Design a binder for these strands. Structure first.
Ligand SMILES: [Cl-]
Lengths: 76, 77
DNA sequence: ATGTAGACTATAGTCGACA
DNA sequence: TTGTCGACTATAGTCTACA
């Protein structure tokens, strides 16, 4: 059960909630499917870098900021 | 082509060269195929988080450090 | 609003062969 | 040593509907 993947999905959900988005909102902005967004947040599905990039765009967060948050989660 | 993917593969190759590894060495350690390692570095192939995780392990670099380097590349040029 | 189900497509990732 | 091509298997990512 992948450590990094679980940190990545955690950061995605955390950012999503801060911005008050629904999964559907993020799906729309990400150009991804709602169910796949759920799969990622809930079941730690293994997304690609491209899909992560689209999600970062959809969440309206810079990659830099995203990875900064990600580093912070890993450090705990 | 994808901006982020190109930064990721760049960091991977850069680390690989610093450690004096061949693609084959990294394939072995990563538990990935040599040709896929080539695909990533050369053709910006779209790896998953799991495969990136395995590569980070194969390169013997912490995720933290990897993403620190990655942030630095993004901040340029 | 979210998660699961299932069936279906595109492509991740393997493998042998050779330049 | 690396990159490629092509063929194969595994799974990311889609879509519909429903509790
Ligand atoms: Cl070069």
């Amino acid at each position: 059960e992948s450590f990094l993947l679980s940190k990545v999905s955690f950061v995605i959900k955390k950012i999503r909630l801060e911005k008050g988005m629904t999964q559907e909102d993020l799906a729309y902005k990400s150009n991804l499917d709602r169910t796949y967004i759920s799969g990622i947040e809930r079941n730690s599905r293994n997304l690609t870098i491209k899909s992560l990039e689209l999600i970062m765009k959809g969440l309206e967060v810079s990659d830099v900021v995203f990875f900064e948050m990600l580093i912070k989660e890993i450090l705990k």
